[PDB]
Design a protein around this ligand. Structure first.
Ligand SMILES: *O[C@H]1[C@H](O)[C@@H](N)[C@@H](O[C@H]2[C@H](O[C@@H]3O[C@H](CO)[C@@H](O[C@H]4O[C@@H](CN)[C@@H](O)[C@H](O)[C@H]4N)[C@H]3O)[C@@H](O)[C@H](N)C[C@@H]2N)O[C@@H]1CO
Ligand SMILES: NC[C@@H]1O[C@H](O[C@H]2[C@@H](O)[C@H](O[C@@H]3[C@@H](O)[C@H](N)C[C@H](N)[C@H]3O[C@H]3O[C@H](CO)[C@@H](O)[C@H](O)[C@H]3N)O[C@@H]2CO)[C@H](N)[C@@H](O)[C@@H]1O
Ligand SMILES: [Mg+2]
Ligand SMILES: [Mg+2]
Ligand SMILES: [Mg+2]
Ligand SMILES: [Mg+2]
Ligand SMILES: [Mg+2]
Lengths: 227, 197, 140, 53, 68, 52, 144, 130, 77
RNA sequence: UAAGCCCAAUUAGUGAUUGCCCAUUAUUCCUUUGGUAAGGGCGGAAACAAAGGAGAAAGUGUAGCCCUUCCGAUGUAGAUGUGGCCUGGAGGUUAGGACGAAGCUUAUGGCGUGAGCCUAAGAUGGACCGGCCUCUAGUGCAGAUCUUGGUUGGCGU
RNA sequence: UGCAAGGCCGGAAAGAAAAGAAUUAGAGGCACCAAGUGGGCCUUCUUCGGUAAGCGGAGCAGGCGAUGCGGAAUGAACCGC
RNA sequence: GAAAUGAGCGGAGUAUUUGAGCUGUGCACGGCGCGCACGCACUCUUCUCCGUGAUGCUCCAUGUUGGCGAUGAAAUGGGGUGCCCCCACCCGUCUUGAAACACGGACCAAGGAGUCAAACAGACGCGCAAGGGAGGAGAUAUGGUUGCCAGUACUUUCUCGUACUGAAAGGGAGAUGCAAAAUGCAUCUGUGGUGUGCACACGUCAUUUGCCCAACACCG
């Protein structure tokens, strides 16, 4: 028992160390998620002010063009041309109803124009991000697809000291930040259900009376029937 | 339902077990699979993975090759440290062409009867892998060597031998038979001894 | 010289003791507390060994192989019969002195031998009770 | 598909094995240890026959 | 009788299964054989000095070790 | 789950007990009705004063 | 062993690895090295280049016993000197005598460094083997 | 003995994988032979056809091989083979071999009550009393 | 590229059939901008300012408005 | 007074979401099987008689060393793997049989994904034979206008 | 003292800024051995011969071949998968 | 409830700090040539805290209330024969395509088709390794024995390889230093040199370097 006593005296130190690191990370996720909620509520009030200052003097407020798109794949894997098939691989949309967050810059929009009959994209809200990260957000840990259960498992994954909780990931996704790529390449591609209530027409664009293409924030009610 | 097109082509061939029927290689694979997981040393990772390998992929080393690369490391060793233990996963053969050699300490998977004699006559020592698991159990102060795979007959026959650039040897039991047409410029053409890339 | 780890490679697929019936691999070793064809439980090649056996009446025998006299086959298994109503935690310590990795299994074995000799003497108090009838040709 | 094989030259085109139509042309050494024994038995029977030369 | 002459149908799909293997870098196989020969013979004069400079530098790196 | 189970939504975001408590005095019909009584007096005041 | 054969595995597969379209048929490409310049020209040119022609003089009735001349180098002369006798060998002293024709090796060549000075008795020797054993401290003595 | 217990025996399929179209031919056994037919409806996996054995039909490994009594079966041939099943007793059951005569089954069935080892084909009348 | 590989052809032309390539022009431009910067940071301080994005949300002061309406006379052409 | 054609809705100028019906798809839950698989445990912690229980093997592959986790899974021609199955004989080991071996029979169940194995009953048989490890080959049938024997509908025509 | 070449020594190195300023279910590079196949056919689009053709011949891709399943009542190839 | 990890089960209290209001002061914003619809900085509504490692490596065992079941049945399956609703084209073969108005196909038993040898090659197993190995034949345990035993044990030139090249006559490969002699001289612990390159040795950060093994490229 001379060897077995030193092991449980070292296991005794690793229990109080994980109990300290659990409550230390509970506070700095309680504190950091309050900071972001003040930003989400306060900066939302700022644009309500500027759009009244615009409207009162007959001016217009050109809103900032959206920097983040949510992109779900709505057609299956059959009969796909090799240019369209590679872009659907480079967006990590390899199965039907897989969904990814992408940036909305000029390199990414010219990839989304080339595969529009296969995808339905649009502009997500704050609740669309946090429903996808909480309910159906998983991570690539040890090359495996493991579901987000605690913020310790997120902090063990990214090792960034800026991404320590699940509100850090919905921060970097919703407001692009310095680490949009590392958060989204951190997660597995989101695998959603088919939408309840149906799809109107898979084979035509959203303007034509169907479903593919861009929805200039209407993609939230379509994803709210899937998450 | 997943579009996994080039996903079987990313797979490689690993073979975690050995094909050998020797019951003493299986004891070293019992010992070095233990040390590979239970130690952070990259030595035991490589010594375990090279012990699995086939007898063609455990090409042997010569004793005059161990005596030259240990010399070129003992040139820039401070002489207060002794020398590494040379370890090869494979066979050490003797070299006739190198008479006198220093007192080096060699761990091999098998020695010749004459490579064993010329090591211990130089003041050296022939070790073994159970004996290397006791002195330096993680490979501290070792020098891991392989032995040469080019220069084999089979490697010299690998190729087309009649496309330009290729200097491989033809499979011919008769040496003076395949020497005429396509191998001399007077006999209608001769394959170009050099081709760019 | 010839270690137990080498002797296990030689006999694992072919032995007198293996008895691969169906696909079960149940060892016929008489120095095996478990019946399993494992390395820890085969007592004929392990350099120390200890099996617990029946004895006279209800006593519990313990056959121990210490590592000393494996060279000699008739001096290598020493047997030590305990009391008739021996406490089975003591039979576990009688083999945990030589090999502590057969401690939990030999308690269960010694407890099994006390359940059997209580039952072997229980089913003969009814079999001889059934056996009052006219029979033919007794043997002696 | 032929590949990088040696050009064979195996020299077995002259009715050498005994089939249903051919007597064959074939020489097998199954009596090698019995003629080995015979020559020694016959050298020991001869060493007696000449004795003591 | 008559059959199908020439087709290029499957070939581009066959050519991309094991990929179009891309070009190799410019430090591999950069043989100067066949290049302009007065500058090829000049560069041999220089490499036979750079080898004996490399034999002398390494020999000078050893005496700066046996004294320290 | 994680937007509907109680202890996983709180294991990930400890501030959700404040977000839900903030969104109860917003749904409250006593707070609500005297919040539109004031926002239809704070905004129209700044509307008629920015047009002068 | 017949049980180890591919026949036993594909037993039941009714084509034995030869296919439905093009069958296994007796000599579909000829018997032997047929068609070496005709329909196997790409095989015979690519893999077996210098076939098909003539080269050199005709040595009628070659005897390979008078053209016997095996070869040993200077670095492999330790193969012929006994291990008792190389250690006593020093330049300027008494050196071992190696009789090459009693060992094979009609000709001595001069590759590598000679690791022990000795007196070599050889039928033949080269420029750079004679030069290189007289400086090492031995010699070479001609024999027949 | 009473058997050791586990979850309920699922048995993905209890129907035998019989041969395709064997009922029409008295030669053809019911043992499974795989179709290599190029136009075979069983091989091409039509809708109304027989199924084919597959890795998905395999049995739950926690409950695989156990008989409906709750016992795995170990075939024995004499009395000394009861001695292996003394510790391995609530897991395995004895199956006296068919060629074991009627004289040697008495010696096996007496001791398998003494030694309390379940026989799968012996002394089921006597195990019912005690 | 031939079948499954991109082999490197070493052709030889006359000198009029080559132009010098401006392919690396935009890379030698931002390379020498990285010795323009780092020669203004370590020693001096004077830098040209970073350019703000036109994709942000500003206010629009309409200096001219029209009505896009598809008049009747747009069809008579 | 469409169950037709063109538009349009979703329970209807009521107060905002998705009328519902069907997949070898999707999500998710089980079980199997294979990974370029990824991690953990394997120095028996203490203790425990009968009249809380058993296991724990340093391991390619098993009735898988034991758990946890993740992903894939169809396929002709074809390749390969299989402590994958089967038959005759040989070397070894371990056992059966006149209280009934081989063979044959089956509303004889059992269990294996399967090839198959095993039990039981014969109101069958009447003397040989099983299991495991190796070795070996004249070693697996449904069809070749297949070979040989027999039988059968046509047909009491 | 310039030029061209191969080295040597020291320096710097947003490891590539900001301007929409990439993304990747992105391990790269070699080699051995050997099958089957080398009758194809259909389709959106481009197209040639033809009066035309369920005709003949091509281009880019996708399919059947080799593969079911859910739909178009039925249909190798259409729609969905 | 065989470790119930909870805003949920417990303890400990009367509060904790989230929003909504109403706001100060700077800045930012909106107009001009003073506004701020309360953006950034520093009274209403809400429950808030700390808790329990595995001394369990793994597996399996613990409710309640009836109905049935008293050792002659009950109960789950399995098997057998029908039936209902549903689904379902004849198998093998060539073929772009067969359910075919395309071939072969009445039933059963028993036979019935990648074998053996020779030459090379590659993969892998094994022995020895600058060496390897015979073959033929002897020899004597056996000059024995029905047999085992045509096996085993033992012993010697020939062949493959260590060196290639030339049509042939023929010739015949180390490194370094000094150095420039139509066989230069001296050393003999040694990768021919450069780029990339496991392991290991000394520092650094959350790889710098040395040696580079196997290997590749460029040369000599
Ligand atoms: O040696 C050459 C090699 O044979 C050749 N394949 C190629 O390598 C590619 C590489 O391709 C992979 O090489 C693997 C085997 O060589 C192969 O993987 C697959 O091979 C099959 C059987 N060999 C399957 O069994 C299995 O699907 C899988 N292992 C190829 O994927 C590519 O992955 C690299 N991207 C580029 C290499 N050039 O070239 C070698 C050069 O000689
Ligand atoms: N040159 C530096 C050294 O090269 C060594 O390797 C060198 C040699 O050992 C090696 O030579 C090997 C030889 O060992 C082996 N016995 C035969 C093999 N064919 C040779 O290989 C070399 O020689 C032939 C000659 O034509 C060349 O065609 C071939 O391209 C080349 N690989 O190749 C290199 C010759 O330039 C080691 N890699 C290492 O010690 C060190 O890096
Ligand atoms: Mg001529
Ligand atoms: Mg097949
Ligand atoms: Mg046969
Ligand atoms: Mg075909
Ligand atoms: Mg050679």
């Amino acid at each position: 028992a001379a060897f077995k006593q030193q092991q449980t005296e070292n296991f005794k130190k690793a229990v109080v160390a994980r109990k300290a690191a659990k409550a230390a990370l509970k506070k700095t996720a309680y504190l950091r998620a309050r900071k972001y909620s003040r930003e989400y509520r306060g900066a939302e009030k700022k644009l309500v002010t500027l759009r009244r200052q615009a409207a009162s003097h007959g001016n217009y407020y050109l809103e900032a063009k959206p920097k983040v798109a949510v992109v779900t794949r709505i057609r299956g894997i059959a009969k796909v041309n090799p240019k369209q098939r590679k872009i659907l691989q480079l967006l990590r949309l390899r199965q039907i109803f897989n969904t990814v967050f992408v940036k909305m810059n000029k390199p990414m929009e010219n990839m989304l124009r080339a595969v529009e009959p296969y995808i339905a994209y649009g502009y997500p809200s704050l609740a669309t991000v946090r429903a996808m990260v909480y309910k159906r957000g998983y991570l690539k840990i040890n090359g495996q697809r493991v579901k987000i259960t605690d913020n310790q498992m997120i902090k063990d994954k990214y090792n960034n000291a800026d991404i320590v909780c699940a509100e850090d990931m919905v921060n970097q996704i919703y407001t692009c930040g310095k680490h949009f790529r590392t958060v989204t390449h951190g997660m597995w591609p989101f695998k959603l259900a088919p939408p309840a209530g149906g799809m109107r027409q898979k084979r035509r664009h959203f303007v034509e009376g169907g479903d593919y293409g861009n929805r200039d924030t209407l993609i939230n009610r379509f994803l709210a029937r899937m998450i | 339902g997943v579009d996994l097109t080039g996903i079987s082509k990313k797979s490689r061939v690993i073979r975690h077990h050995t094909y050998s029927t020797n019951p003493y290689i299986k004891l070293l694979i019992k010992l070095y699979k233990f040390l590979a997981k239970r130690t952070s040393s990259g030595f035991n990772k490589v010594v375990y993975q090279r012990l699995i390998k086939s007898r063609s992929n455990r090409a042997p080393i010569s004793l005059s090759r161990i005596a030259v690369v240990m010399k070129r490391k003992a040139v820039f060793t401070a002489k207060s440290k002794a020398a590494p233990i040379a370890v090869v996963v494979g066979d050490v053969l003797d070299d006739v062409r190198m008479a006198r050699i220093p007192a080096m300490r060699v761990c091999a998977l098998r020695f010749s009867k004459s490579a064993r004699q010329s090591i211990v006559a130089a003041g050296g020592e022939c070790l073994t892998f159970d004996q290397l698991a006791m002195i330096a159990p993680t490979g501290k102060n070792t020098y891991l060597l392989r032995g040469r795979k080019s220069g084999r007959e089979s490697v010299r026959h690998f190729g087309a031998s009649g496309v330009p650039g290729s200097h491989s040897k033809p499979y011919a039991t008769n040496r003076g038979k395949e020497t005429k047409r396509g191998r001399r410029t007077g006999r209608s053409y001769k394959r170009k001894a050099f081709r760019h890339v | 010289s010839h270690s137990v780890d080498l002797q296990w490679i030689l006999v694992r697929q072919n032995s007198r003791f293996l008895q691969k019936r169906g696909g079960i691999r149940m060892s016929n070793d008489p120095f095996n507390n478990n019946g399993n064809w494992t390395k820890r439980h085969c007592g004929f090649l392990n350099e120390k060994a200890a099996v617990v056996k029946p004895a006279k009446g209800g006593a519990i025998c313990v056959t121990v192989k210490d590592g000393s006299s494996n060279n000699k086959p008739r001096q290598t298994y020493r047997k030590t019969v305990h009391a008739a109503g021996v406490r089975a935690s003591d039979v576990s310590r009688a083999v945990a002195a030589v090999r502590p990795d057969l401690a939990d299994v030999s308690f269960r074995r010694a407890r099994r031998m006390a359940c059997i000799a209580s039952r072997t003497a229980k089913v003969a108090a009814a079999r001889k009770a059934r056996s009052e009838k006219i029979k033919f040709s007794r043997k002696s | 598909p032929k590949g990088n094989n040696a050009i064979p030259h195996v020299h077995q085109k002259k009715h050498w094995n005994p089939c249903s139509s051919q007597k064959g042309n074939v020489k097998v050494f199954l009596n090698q240890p019995a003629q080995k024994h015979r020559r020694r038995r016959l050298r020991l029977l001869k060493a007696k026959k000449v004795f003591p030369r | 009788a008559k059959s199908k002459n020439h087709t290029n149908h499957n070939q581009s799909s066959k050519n991309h299964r094991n990929g179009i293997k891309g070009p190799m870098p410019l430090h591999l196989h950069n043989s100067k054989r066949g290049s302009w020969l007065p500058a090829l013979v000049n560069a041999r004069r220089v490499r036979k000095h750079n080898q004996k400079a490399a034999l002398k530098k390494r020999r000078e790196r050893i005496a700066a070790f046996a004294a320290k | 789950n994680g937007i509907k189970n109680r202890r996983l939504r709180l294991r990930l975001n400890p501030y959700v007990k404040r977000e839900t408590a903030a969104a109860k005095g917003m749904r409250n019909v006593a707070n609500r009705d005297a919040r539109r009584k004031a926002k239809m007096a704070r905004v129209t005041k700044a509307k008629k004063a920015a047009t002068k | 062993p017949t049980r180890f054969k591919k026949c036993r595995h594909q037993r039941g597969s009714t084509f034995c690895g030869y296919g439905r379209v093009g069958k296994h048929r007796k000599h579909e490409s000829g018997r032997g090295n047929a068609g070496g310049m005709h329909h196997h020209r790409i095989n015979f040119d690519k893999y077996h280049p210098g076939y098909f022609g003539k080269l050199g003089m005709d040595h009628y009735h070659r005897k390979k016993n008078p053209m016997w001349k095996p070869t040993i180098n200077l670095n492999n002369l330790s193969r012929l000197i006994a291990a008792e006798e190389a250690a006593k060998a020093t330049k300027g002293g008494t050196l071992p005598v190696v009789d090459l024709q009693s060992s094979g090796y009609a000709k001595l060549l001069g590759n590598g460094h000679i690791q022990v000075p000795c007196i070599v008795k050889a039928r033949y020797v080269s420029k750079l083997a004679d030069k290189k054993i007289r400086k090492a401290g031995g010699a070479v003595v001609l024999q027949a | 003995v009473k058997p050791t217990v586990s979850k309920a025996i699922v048995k993905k399929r209890t129907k035998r994988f019989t041969r395709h179209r064997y009922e029409l031919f008295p030669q053809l056994s019911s043992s499974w032979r795989k179709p290599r037919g190029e136009d075979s409806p069983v091989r091409r996996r039509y809708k109304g056809q027989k199924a084919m054995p597959n890795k998905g039909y395999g049995s739950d490994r926690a409950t695989k091989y156990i008989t409906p009594s709750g016992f795995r079966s170990f075939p024995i041939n004499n009395v000394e083979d009861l001695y292996m099943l003394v510790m391995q007793n609530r897991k395995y059951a004895g199956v006296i071999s068919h060629t074991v005569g009627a004289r040697k089954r008495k010696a096996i069935a007496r001791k398998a009550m003494e030694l309390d080892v379940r026989l799968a084909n012996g002394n089921a009348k006597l195990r019912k009393i005690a | 590229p031939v079948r499954t590989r991109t082999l490197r052809k070493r052709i030889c032309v006359r000198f009029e059939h080559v132009r010098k390539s401006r392919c690396q022009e935009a890379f030698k431009a931002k390379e020498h901008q990285f010795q323009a910067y780092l020669a203004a940071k370590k020693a001096g301080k004077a830098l040209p300012p970073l350019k703000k994005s036109s994709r942000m949300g500003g206010i629009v002061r309409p200096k001219n408005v029209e009505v896009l309406a598809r008049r009747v006379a747009d069809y008579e052409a």
